[PDB]
Design an enzyme around this catalytic site. Structure first.
Site, short mmCIF file in Angstrom:
data_model
loop_
_atom_site.label_atom_id
_atom_site.label_comp_id
_atom_site.label_asym_id
_atom_site.label_seq_id
_atom_site.Cartn_x
_atom_site.Cartn_y
_atom_site.Cartn_z
N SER A 117 0.82 -1.20 0.00
CA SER A 117 0.00 0.00 0.00
C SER A 117 0.86 1.25 0.00
O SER A 117 1.96 1.26 0.54
CB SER A 117 -0.93 0.00 1.22
OG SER A 117 -1.55 1.26 1.43
N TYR A 141 -1.61 0.23 10.28
CA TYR A 141 -1.83 -0.43 9.00
C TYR A 141 -0.64 -0.18 8.07
O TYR A 141 -0.06 -1.13 7.52
CB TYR A 141 -3.14 0.06 8.36
CG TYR A 141 -3.31 -0.35 6.91
CD1 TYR A 141 -3.71 -1.65 6.57
CD2 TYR A 141 -3.08 0.55 5.88
CE1 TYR A 141 -3.86 -2.02 5.24
CE2 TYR A 141 -3.23 0.18 4.56
CZ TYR A 141 -3.62 -1.09 4.24
OH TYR A 141 -3.76 -1.44 2.92
N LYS A 145 2.33 -2.95 6.84
CA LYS A 145 2.63 -3.17 5.41
C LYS A 145 4.11 -2.94 5.13
O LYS A 145 4.74 -3.67 4.34
CB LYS A 145 1.78 -2.24 4.53
CG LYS A 145 0.30 -2.52 4.57
CD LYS A 145 -0.04 -3.89 3.97
CE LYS A 145 -1.50 -4.20 4.26
NZ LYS A 145 -1.99 -5.47 3.67
N1 LIG Z 1 -8.81 -2.44 -1.29
C1 LIG Z 1 -7.88 -1.42 -1.34
O1 LIG Z 1 -8.21 -0.25 -1.57
C2 LIG Z 1 -6.44 -1.73 -1.10
C3 LIG Z 1 -5.49 -0.71 -1.01
C4 LIG Z 1 -4.15 -0.98 -0.79
C5 LIG Z 1 -3.75 -2.32 -0.64
N2 LIG Z 1 -4.69 -3.32 -0.74
C6 LIG Z 1 -4.21 -4.78 -0.57
O2 LIG Z 1 -5.14 -5.66 -1.10
C7 LIG Z 1 -5.29 -6.74 -0.15
C8 LIG Z 1 -6.70 -6.64 0.32
O3 LIG Z 1 -7.42 -7.03 -0.73
P1 LIG Z 1 -9.01 -6.42 -0.63
O4 LIG Z 1 -8.70 -4.95 -0.73
O5 LIG Z 1 -9.56 -7.36 -1.64
O6 LIG Z 1 -9.57 -6.93 0.79
P2 LIG Z 1 -10.62 -8.11 0.85
O7 LIG Z 1 -10.77 -8.19 2.36
O8 LIG Z 1 -11.75 -8.19 -0.14
O9 LIG Z 1 -9.71 -9.54 0.46
C9 LIG Z 1 -8.92 -9.98 1.54
C10 LIG Z 1 -8.91 -11.52 1.48
O10 LIG Z 1 -7.91 -12.09 2.37
C11 LIG Z 1 -8.54 -13.14 3.12
N3 LIG Z 1 -7.75 -13.22 4.38
C12 LIG Z 1 -7.55 -12.24 5.39
N4 LIG Z 1 -6.77 -12.67 6.38
C13 LIG Z 1 -6.44 -13.99 6.01
C14 LIG Z 1 -5.64 -15.00 6.65
N5 LIG Z 1 -5.03 -14.75 7.86
N6 LIG Z 1 -5.49 -16.19 6.07
C15 LIG Z 1 -6.12 -16.41 4.88
N7 LIG Z 1 -6.91 -15.58 4.15
C16 LIG Z 1 -7.05 -14.35 4.77
C17 LIG Z 1 -10.00 -12.56 3.36
O11 LIG Z 1 -10.90 -13.60 3.64
C18 LIG Z 1 -10.30 -11.94 1.97
O12 LIG Z 1 -10.77 -12.88 1.05
C19 LIG Z 1 -4.33 -6.49 1.05
O13 LIG Z 1 -3.16 -7.16 0.75
C20 LIG Z 1 -4.09 -5.00 0.97
O14 LIG Z 1 -2.76 -4.64 1.25
C21 LIG Z 1 -6.04 -3.09 -0.95
#
Ligand SMILES: NC(=O)c1ccc[n+]([C@@H]2O[C@H](COP(=O)([O-])OP(=O)(O)OC[C@H]3O[C@@H](n4cnc5c(N)ncnc54)[C@H](O)[C@@H]3O)[C@@H](O)[C@H]2O)c1
Ligand SMILES: [Zn+2]
Length: 325
Positions: A117, A141, A145
């Site tokens: 991020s 957060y 990261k």
């Molecule tokens: N959505 C955004 O705006 C944004 C911005 C910056 C970074 N990100 C990155 O994207 C990812 C988040 O993706 P999202 O935005 O789809 O969130 P999201 O919550 O839809 O997807 C997260 C997934 O990870 C799974 N998960 C969480 N903890 C877990 C664990 N301990 N073991 C196994 N599975 C696990 C959850 O069930 C979910 O399916 C993160 O890595 C985050 O750094 C997202």
């Protein structure tokens, strides 16, 4: 041998990436604990329910599928929550990532694409933000990261781990064909909240500041289409596959978008207005935040293709009870 392990692949960005992988001939294998993701989103290959902290099950999975790469999305996050519950973020983002990286080195599973991020930067010295900018995050957060990024670097030194860390601000939009969306509860991301409010699923959208030193008067933030994100994560796989070196690059359009612009577009494209409530600006709040996308262009050959506001709004709108006309 075309399996790709998509850890967190049942979530928003992960499921889009799984879809894209399948379109490009890979066999995505989703490993996900369904804590915030959705089993129904795992439509393009095998599903393994599991926690990344369950190291035996994660190792077992890597041994079975022998993935040619691992894409790490498995870190749930709500906007603002890390300051009050840092334990959750240190446990999942640091503890969980270490368990994943240990599973990788112990199975000689080599190529890791880490979804990071731009929060790692904190408040920037120059706009747009380049990768050289100091990383001084202002909440747990961002902190955790950043810790994962450094852990990747240390595991590379010690174990020959190869990786690409991908930094970006706000994932937005949805798949162009309308069958895969952002399903969060609580939904804390801005564009979904604004749309939910326009659709009457929320009563109000509280916007903090009409006072910023910008045009609009409202703060500028950085939005990238989720399909573009999927594209970049797969390019990162191809990079490491064709023997590329370790990378940490920003993803985005290079141009910011204000809150007024977003609310305007939603109203214009959907015919429903967003019931904004303007509240006092927060003292130390940055007026504009967006990343410099040039390194990703140079190193990955990546440019956004779907991250115009119109496409972001159009593709997201149907998933939040709005209609595009
Ligand atoms: N959505 C955004 O705006 C944004 C911005 C910056 C970074 N990100 C990155 O994207 C990812 C988040 O993706 P999202 O935005 O789809 O969130 P999201 O919550 O839809 O997807 C997260 C997934 O990870 C799974 N998960 C969480 N903890 C877990 C664990 N301990 N073991 C196994 N599975 C696990 C959850 O069930 C979910 O399916 C993160 O890595 C985050 O750094 C997202
Ligand atoms: Zn969300």
């Amino acid at each position: 041998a075309n399996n790709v392990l998509v850890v967190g692949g049942a979530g928003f960005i992960g499921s889009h990436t799984a879809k894209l992988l399948a379109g490009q001939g890979y066999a995505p294998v989703v490993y996900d604990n369904l804590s915030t993701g959705h089993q129904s989103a795992v439509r393009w290959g095998d599903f393994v329910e599991g926690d990344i902290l369950d190291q035996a099950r994660l190792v077992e999975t890597m041994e079975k599928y022998a993935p040619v790469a691992v894409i790490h999305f498995a870190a749930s996050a709500y906007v603002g929550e890390s300051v009050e519950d840092p334990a959750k973020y240190y446990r999942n983002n640091v503890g969980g990532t270490q368990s994943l990286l240990d599973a990788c080195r112990l199975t000689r599973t080599q190529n890791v694409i880490f979804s990071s991020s731009c929060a790692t930067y904190g408040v920037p010295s120059r706009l747009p933000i380049g990768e050289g900018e100091a990383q001084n995050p202002i909440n747990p957060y961002g902190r955790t990261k950043l810790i994962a990024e450094h852990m990747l670097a240390d595991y590379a030194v010690a174990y020959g781990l190869r990786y690409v860390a991908l930094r970006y601000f706000n994932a937005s939009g949805a798949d162009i064909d309308g069958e895969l969306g952002e399903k969060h509860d609580p939904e804390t991301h801005l564009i979904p909240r604004a749309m939910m409010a326009a659709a009457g699923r929320l009563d109000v959208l509280e916007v903090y500041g009409d006072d910023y030193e910008t045009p609009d008067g409202t703060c500028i933030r950085d939005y990238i289409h989720v399909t573009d994100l999927a594209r970049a994560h797969v390019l990162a796989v191809e990079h490491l596959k064709e023997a590329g070196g370790n990378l940490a690059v920003n993803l985005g359009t290079g141009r910011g978008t204000s809150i007024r612009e977003i609310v305007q577009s939603i109203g214009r494209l959907t015919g429903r207005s967003v019931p904004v409530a303007m509240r006092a600006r927060r003292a130390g709040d940055p007026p504009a935040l967006y990343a410099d996308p040039a390194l990703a262009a140079e190193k990955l050959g990546f440019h956004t293709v779907y991250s115009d506001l119109d496409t972001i709004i159009r593709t997201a709108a149907p998933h939040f009870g709005l209609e595009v006309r």
